[PDB]
Design a protein around this ligand. Sequence first.
Ligand code: HEM
Ligand code: HEM
Ligand SMILES: C[C@H](O)[C@H](O)[C@H]1CNc2nc(N)[nH]c(=O)c2N1
Ligand SMILES: C[C@H](O)[C@H](O)[C@H]1CNc2nc(N)[nH]c(=O)c2N1
Ligand SMILES: N/C(S)=N/CCC[C@H](N)C(=O)O
Ligand SMILES: N/C(S)=N/CCC[C@H](N)C(=O)O
Lengths: 414, 414
Amino acid sequence: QYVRIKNWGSGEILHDTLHHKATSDSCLGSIMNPKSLTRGPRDKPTPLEELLPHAIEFINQYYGSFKEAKIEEHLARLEAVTKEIETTGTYQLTLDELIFATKMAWRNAPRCIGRIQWSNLQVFDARNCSTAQEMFQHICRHILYATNNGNIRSAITVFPQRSDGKHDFRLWNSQLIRYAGYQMPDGTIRGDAATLEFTQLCIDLGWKPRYGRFDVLPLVLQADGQDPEVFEIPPDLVLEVTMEHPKYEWFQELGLKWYALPAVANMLLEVGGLEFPACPFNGWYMGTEIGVRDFCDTQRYNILEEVGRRMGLETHTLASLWKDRAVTEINVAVLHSFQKQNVTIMDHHTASESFMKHMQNEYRARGGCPADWIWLVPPVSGSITPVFHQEMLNYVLSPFYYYQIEPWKTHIWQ
Amino acid sequence: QYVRIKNWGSGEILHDTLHHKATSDSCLGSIMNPKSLTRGPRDKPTPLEELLPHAIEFINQYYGSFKEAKIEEHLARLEAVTKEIETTGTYQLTLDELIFATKMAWRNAPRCIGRIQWSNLQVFDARNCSTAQEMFQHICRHILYATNNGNIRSAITVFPQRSDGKHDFRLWNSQLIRYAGYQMPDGTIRGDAATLEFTQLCIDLGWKPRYGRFDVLPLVLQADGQDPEVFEIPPDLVLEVTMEHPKYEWFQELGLKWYALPAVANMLLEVGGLEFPACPFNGWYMGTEIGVRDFCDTQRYNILEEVGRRMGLETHTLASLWKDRAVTEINVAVLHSFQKQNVTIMDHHTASESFMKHMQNEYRARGGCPADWIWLVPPVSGSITPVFHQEMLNYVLSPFYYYQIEPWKTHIWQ
Ligand code: HEM
Ligand code: HEM
Ligand SMILES: C[C@H](O)[C@H](O)[C@H]1CNc2nc(N)[nH]c(=O)c2N1
Ligand SMILES: C[C@H](O)[C@H](O)[C@H]1CNc2nc(N)[nH]c(=O)c2N1
Ligand SMILES: N/C(S)=N/CCC[C@H](N)C(=O)O
Ligand SMILES: N/C(S)=N/CCC[C@H](N)C(=O)O
């Protein structure tokens, strides 16, 4: 009938009618959460006829990998899985298979610039898990391992796969560590406005509102099918970086800081027909994420106004390019602060140069590299970056890390 | 078989094979010159059965416009055109129709941020033209009018429409005014490296190589079907702005300047079935085009290296964010210099804010607004801009300004 378009800034929604008068030649590229990048709920298992080919394909991918293939085991595994499939319905992956799965799924994530590190990933097998409390433990083991006291390490903890579709393990949080946002009495908003709805949720589930600007949210976990059990993260586990500029000593007066661990929680790993609706992973921050997005977005901490004022710029004259100047300094503050306190981080430039090297290896190797230009290009200094001037195709392969419908919209309440 | 991907930076070409293993859900969005945005040559006129509906549709669009429609004339014109069509083959547009055509075609250009000015456009009817020399005159009239001694005015001069497909009027240049690029003896490259191949062309057609960094290229024009007649632009007509920073007095030592007129030449206007392969237009510069793209691209003047050195930054440490700092200053230099010498220009921020206002008017009015996010988002400070956080659909409507195959590839040599 029509297409819904949202402005992630003002949150305003629009309905596009004109597209119908289009030509006999409508790129969805700009859209954030398309259905084509999401993998929703269920009620029944994966029909055999589908599950089977996907499975075989996957096993063929895996075994087609290693130098001098293990043809016998290849056939054997195919056979063994085929069998296991017809016998149980679903099937289990050899640990080494999962490792390969997650690495490829990351390798296939079109919106990630860190993919040159695809081969350096740590996998935590939590497939035998069965309780929320047990999830919580694996998660802490994750956070601890990942953090590694500043020398951040990429890792992913894989929880139980999808069975029927009503026995799903799910982390309700956006990412492992994430500050809270509260709509205060004086009409204002303290903390991270992005986590506003979710915060209220934690509150409803009896969470203790610490009412600050940097209150690390609790882990909302749900096992099998059972409701979400709220678990607060141990502060000793949450490493943070206090922001301070290398020349503007007044920058620390802003009382700013940010968590050192970027760990996406709510994504789904699809592989060989199976799907794991819970498998948080982490890489390491890229300056701009914090400096530009987190600190400067209108919908986030929105600091640009005062970082500009305190710098003395003509904040009431757009043409003075103060916003450009301010942001750059916030960026160095972040980079400086992470660098100073020995917490891994990568500036957007060195990041892009490496991604360019990634493609070069990727195309030469397998013949392609799914890339979302809209996402891959840094939020600042776009054309200064090599990736801006790089044409790229955005396509979904398998395995893959799909988005998924926010669990609180589709959940049973016993 | 496979998809060709080019890196507009290193000019390197790659062949994507992987896309085939895609899912049963491949956005071309990143591609610069897709076939879906181009309208090539011909050998025969526009088959009646096609020409007719497009024509009627167009006339319906036009007459459906004005408050209290002129139904009688509507029908009359439909009839009159229908008749004219079956009688001549092609047909002629009432002047007021062309005006409406160009404004809508601009209004439908998904890669332009200045579209809030869609209604403020000047149209020069050069449809009765017939010689290159005569083109040259209209062009000068254009450049002169457009320039308006700094207070730049948006305008478009429409040359003769397409007849058979071998009697096309075509401007071989990228844009009206554009500096030259010469691959010098000492291996270096002076001027605008983008206009390297084209420059050689001018040279081959006996053009006098002035061997500098800012030599405004000659107008390569071709009328009817006849070969390109070289015409040099009158220097009194070419207004320029000498670059100078408001605080770094050493910035003018760079001996930098740029033309004040952004006038795209090589595009094609499609409307009601007809197509005008020659109809250069112009708006007015947006800082970043010159400051970021023109001055800082590796493939252009590439000044970032020394603007950084002269500023004293750690040019050998990407992480110092010097590139971010340098560019911002070059940007203010451009804005300052244009502002100082009273030449219209708009910073990227004020530009985006107005475009946001444009959509608001556009959606509310007609129900849509074709937008290419990849193009609309400024080459620097992306997320600082409102358009970054704006989801948008990129679709081709009609009328429309299509790209077109570089004429020197498809041309007769008598
Ligand atoms: C090793 C360092 C890594 C870096 C520098 C890196 C960087 C990034 C950046 C800059 C983004 C955009 C984030 C945003 O704007 O929200 C991103 C997205 C993403 N990354 Fe990577 N990443 C890294 C590791 C990983 C790992 C280890 C995985 C998976 C195993 C991964 C999976 C993804 C996915 C799926 C997205 C898309 C998130 C979404 O759609 O919201 N990344 N990453
Ligand atoms: C009034 C001021 C205007 C401004 C501020 C403006 C600005 C821009 C900018 C920033 C771009 C991108 C340029 C590039 O990166 O190469 C652009 C592209 C474009 N503009 Fe606008 N423009 C204006 C007027 C116009 C007018 C008057 C027309 C047509 C009648 C127009 C048609 C287009 C088209 C077709 C493109 C795409 C060019 C391409 O695909 O290479 N613009 N404009
Ligand atoms: C609407 C638009 O797609 C959206 O604001 C984008 C664009 N590119 C992005 N790129 C990254 N890396 N992260 C983002 O959140 C976004 N958001
Ligand atoms: C490959 C990529 O599409 C290309 O470098 C782009 C992106 N966005 C752009 N946007 C504008 N305004 N102008 C451009 O030339 C480009 N080039
Ligand atoms: N570098 C990585 S893995 N980022 C993932 C999400 C982090 C988010 N952009 C943030 O800024 O919090
Ligand atoms: N503002 C307008 S109409 N731009 C059109 C092309 C100018 C080109 N980007 C340049 O920098 O020369």
